[PDB]
């Protein structure tokens, strides 16, 4: 293996491989996260290239524990590695403290793992950005993590293709008094903007987090919500 | 424990009892000591249960992988050799004696005995276990060449029952298996059907 760093400083002080990884991320499928008073909603677009594909073979929304969930934007193969490591870290924390890991601690550990690949020998940075949702101490959380290793706490956010317009949409139509169902309606509407084709229950994925835990909605419920809208 | 295997023209007959004790207390009385390593290869186990079970699992894994690579059914001699290598490598730790018996198209029905120490040898009939010291004269006197398949099940049942009556560590039911080309035939002799 190569023992030298492949990421180095530019004469203007920029780390360029990180910029290229962000360029890779900005070309992925859209994702939306909204935090309400009762829980968090994550939505993503799941358009596929052909009808021969099995729509239920792989999922973008995945549970880390009983109360934490992930979505991503970027490259799928890197997302799988990150998901595996996040699950292992949560299990280690549980083994030590006999208590479920809080969201803000999992985000920190995952961010440190993502940063290790920027200052290590012979490897390239991850090309994915992550949205994490959780429920702790009777209140919800929503975090974002970048390929560089920096994380932020948001109320509503959009990522992927055409995310500036998504952020403007969320800014104009967000207030702190939303219930979870109004949040789901707003998330689906935000995904509707800049969508290609006619959307059904088979080409979007939704996940919710509240007091009972994290769960991904079944296609029947997505059909109900789409009919309502 | 009393285990035994007998060769006949076209296959092998394996027999065992079903008692496992811990001191003078019978922890289990319906134990199954005949384990299939492959489709037509079996082992009978005596000694520490942990050691024999772990070694049988390891050899099952290795033999299955070898068979998948070679695209052929394995030989009895191969499995005997794998058992021999593991038993000899760790002879200061394991306490296990084994009888290997099977049928392969190249050489027919064969039986090997791997005692404590990792030795390996082929025999026409092979007995093993703690209770086998009481049936050496019987099997020496009664065995003859040219036995049929049905004359080897009766001989096995008689020898095992005689070992069961006199040993304190042997008892329960008698489990028999006949291995030949067509397949494996398994049966159990309960209390009424055990010879008296």
């Amino acid at each position: 293996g190569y023992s030298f760093s492949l990421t180095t400083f530019s004469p203007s002080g920029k780390l360029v491989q990180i910029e290229y990884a962000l360029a890779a991320v900005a070309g992925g499928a859209p994702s939306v996260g909204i935090k309400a008073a009762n829980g968090v909603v994550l939505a993503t677009e799941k358009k596929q290239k052909s009808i021969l594909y099995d729509e239920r073979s792989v999922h973008k929304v995945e549970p880390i524990t009983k109360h934490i969930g992930l979505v991503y934007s970027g490259m799928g193969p890197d997302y799988r590695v990150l998901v595996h490591r996040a699950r292992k870290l949560a299990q280690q924390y549980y083994l030590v403290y006999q208590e479920p890991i809080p969201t803000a601690q999992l985000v920190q550990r995952v961010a440190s793992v993502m940063q290790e690949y920027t200052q290590s020998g012979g490897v390239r940075p991850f090309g994915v950005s992550l949205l994490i949702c959780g429920w702790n101490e009777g209140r919800p959380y929503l975090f974002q993590s970048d390929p560089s290793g920096a994380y932020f706490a948001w109320k509503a956010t959009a990522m992927g293709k055409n995310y500036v317009n998504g952020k403007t949409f969320l800014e104009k139509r967000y207030n702190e008094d939303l219930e979870l169902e109004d949040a789901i309606h707003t998330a689906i509407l935000t995904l509707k903007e800049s969508f290609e084709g006619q959307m059904t229950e088979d080409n979007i994925e939704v996940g919710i987090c509240n007091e009972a835990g994290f769960r991904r909605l079944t296609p029947t419920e997505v059909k109900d919500y789409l009919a309502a809208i | 424990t009393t285990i035994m295997a007998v060769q006949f023209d076209g296959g092998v007959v394996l027999g065992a009892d079903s008692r496992t004790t811990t001191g003078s207390y019978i922890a289990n009385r319906v134990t199954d000591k005949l384990t299939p390593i492959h489709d037509r290869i079996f082992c009978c186990r005596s000694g520490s249960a942990a050691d024999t079970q772990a070694v049988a699992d390891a050899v099952t894994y290795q033999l299955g992988f070898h068979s998948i690579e070679l695209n052929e059914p394995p030989l009895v001699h191969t499995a005997a050799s794998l058992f021999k290598e593991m038993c000899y490598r760790y002879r200061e730790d394991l306490m296990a004696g084994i009888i290997i018996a099977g049928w392969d198209p190249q050489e027919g029905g064969q039986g090997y005995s791997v005692p404590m120490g990792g030795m390996m040898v082929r025999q026409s009939f092979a007995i093993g276990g703690s209770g086998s010291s009481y049936i050496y004269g019987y099997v020496d006197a009664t065995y003859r060449e040219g036995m049929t398949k049905e004359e080897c099940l009766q001989f096995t049942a008689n020898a095992l029952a005689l070992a069961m009556e006199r040993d304190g560590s042997s008892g329960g039911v008698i489990r028999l298996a006949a291995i030949a080309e067509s397949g494996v035939e398994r049966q159990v002799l309960l209390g009424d059907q055990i010879p008296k």
């Binding site: 290229y20 360029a23 021969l52 099995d54 193969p77 890197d78 940075p125 | -």
Partner: protein
């Protein structure tokens, strides 16, 4: 569009548009072979069909094949570089055996697919090795939801399908099967798709067929007589 900088075409690092060129070249490494394979699944069976080429008369045709057996219930079709394909098959066999040893029961098809794709993803991050130039198709039977067809590509991506094709004529076969799907005899569909895309009527010795069935879960390879009977049925119907 198409810009580059640094060593981004010689190792696996990002280009100014977030692309990995050395992974895009490994996909063209597949088409160098010049063969095409199809895989179809029905209500109770799964079938894999491959093209068999014997360019030399002195070659032993028994040793020239692209159908392998991973476990007694799983079957494989490999396309691309031959040595890479042998390496991937010999790795998958070991992974399946270790899963069975460790967890006490037979590996599912999708978990084996996951493990292979996880292995393949590493080569696109570490810069001291290159990706393998091959694509894998797996078929099996799972006792709860029936036949399973899965595909892996050298980028680390894996998926499950109703019908798929790999090789040089992948694009044409995709449109053919899309039209056909937009089954009890899937073998006829696979053979006619291959014939249509290749513009050749096949002799019994020019293709290989492997199947798994709900009633016969074990992976088996049809002989030349059965393929000939199927081809005669194609000709008559």
């Amino acid at each position: 569009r198409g810009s580059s900088a640094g060593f981004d075409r010689h190792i696996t690092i990002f280009s100014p548009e977030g692309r990995l060129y050395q992974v895009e070249y490994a996909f063209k490494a597949i088409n160098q072979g010049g063969l095409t394979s199809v895989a179809v699944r029905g209500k109770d069976c799964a079938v894999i069909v491959t093209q068999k080429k014997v360019p030399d008369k002195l070659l032993d045709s028994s040793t020239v094949t692209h159908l392998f057996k991973i476990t007694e219930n799983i079957g494989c079709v490999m396309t691309g570089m031959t040595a890479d394909s042998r390496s991937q098959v010999q790795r998958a066999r070991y992974e399946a055996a270790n899963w069975k040893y460790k967890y006490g029961y037979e590996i599912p098809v999708d978990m084996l697919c996951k493990r292979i794709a996880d292995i393949s993803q590493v080569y696109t991050q570490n810069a001291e090795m290159r990706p393998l130039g091959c694509c894998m198709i797996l078929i099996g039977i799972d006792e709860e939801q029936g036949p399973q067809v899965y595909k892996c590509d050298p980028a680390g991506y894996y998926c499950g399908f109703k019908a798929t094709a790999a090789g040089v004529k992948q694009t044409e076969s995709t449109s053919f099967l899309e039209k056909k799907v937009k089954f009890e005899q899937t073998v006829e569909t696979a053979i006619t798709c291959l014939s249509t895309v290749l513009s050749i009527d096949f002799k019994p010795s020019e293709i290989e067929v492997g199947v798994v069935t709900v009633e016969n879960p074990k992976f088996r390879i049809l002989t030349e007589a059965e393929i000939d009977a199927h081809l005669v049925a194609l000709a008559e119907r």
